[PDB]
Amino acid sequence: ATGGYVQQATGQASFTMYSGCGSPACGKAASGFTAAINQLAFGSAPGLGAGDACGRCFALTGNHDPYSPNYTGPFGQTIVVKVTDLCPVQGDQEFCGQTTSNPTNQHGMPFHFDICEDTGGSAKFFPSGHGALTGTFTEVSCSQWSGSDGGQLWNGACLSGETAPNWPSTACGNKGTAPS
Numbered sequence: 003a004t005g006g007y008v009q010q011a012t013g014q015a016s017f018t019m020y021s022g023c024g025s026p027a028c029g030k031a032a033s034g035f036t037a038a039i040n041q042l043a044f045g046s047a048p049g050l051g052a053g054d055a056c057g058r059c060f061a062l063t064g065n066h067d068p069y070s071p072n073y074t075g076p077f078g079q080t081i082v083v084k085v086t087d088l089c090p091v092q093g094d095q096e097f098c099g100q101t102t103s104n105p106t107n108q109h110g111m112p113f114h115f116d117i118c119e120d121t122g123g124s125a126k127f128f129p130s131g132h133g134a135l136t137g138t139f140t141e142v143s144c145s146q147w148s149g150s151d152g153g154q155l156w157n158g159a160c161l162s163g164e165t166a167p168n169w170p171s172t173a174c175g176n177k178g179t180a181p182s
């Protein structure tokens with residue numbers, strides 16, 4: 003996409019959970035299930051505002067635990083998240099370090115969703131004892147997402163991807179150039 007960001011409506015991803023998603027990088031939280039997405043897909047960098055992932059809705063499915071490769075299941079439910087947040091490239095190199103020159107993480111995945119625990123998404127998705135998974139995602143209409151957006155936390159906040167057609171398309175827009 004613009005900026006060299008890798009923004010595909012469907013693909014393979016890794017998955018983790020995180021806490022404290024009430025002041026996320028898009029500048030609006032939401033009451034439904036939410037996630038952070040890796041920087042290369044988010045479409046912005048820390049401090050540069052919302053990227054084009056902001057507000058888009060995705061159906062996530064886990065089907066492997068790379069840390070317990072003999073575990074056969076059960077996995078969790080497929081859930082629909084709204085992306086509200088950035089999983090930065092400069093932080094966790096295991097999961098969100100994808101760049102334009104090296105577009106997969108340490109699990110070989112080109113995308114990562116960090117699912118916010120606070121509002122219930124991770125309890126639907128991760129079986130007890132299996133908090134890091136790999137699997138798939140597909141962008142869906144936000145008609146498939148229960149929830150209400152929070153208020154703007156700063157000027158420029160954006161979740162306008164919530165009404166956009168699936169990628170390829172533009173809503174909030176990408177900021178600067180993707181990490182190399």
Ligand SMILES: CC(CCO)CCO
Pocket residue numbers: 023024031032033121150152
């Ligand atoms: C759980 C929500 C209550 C306000 O709608 C806040 C989540 O950001």
Ligand SMILES: CC(CCO)CCO
Pocket residue numbers: 072
């Ligand atoms: C064959 C493995 C067990 C698979 O559940 C054990 C030996 O690596």
Ligand SMILES: CC(CCO)CCO
Pocket residue numbers: 076077078079125126127128129130
């Ligand atoms: C996390 C899930 C594992 C069972 O498939 C349960 C969600 O209800």
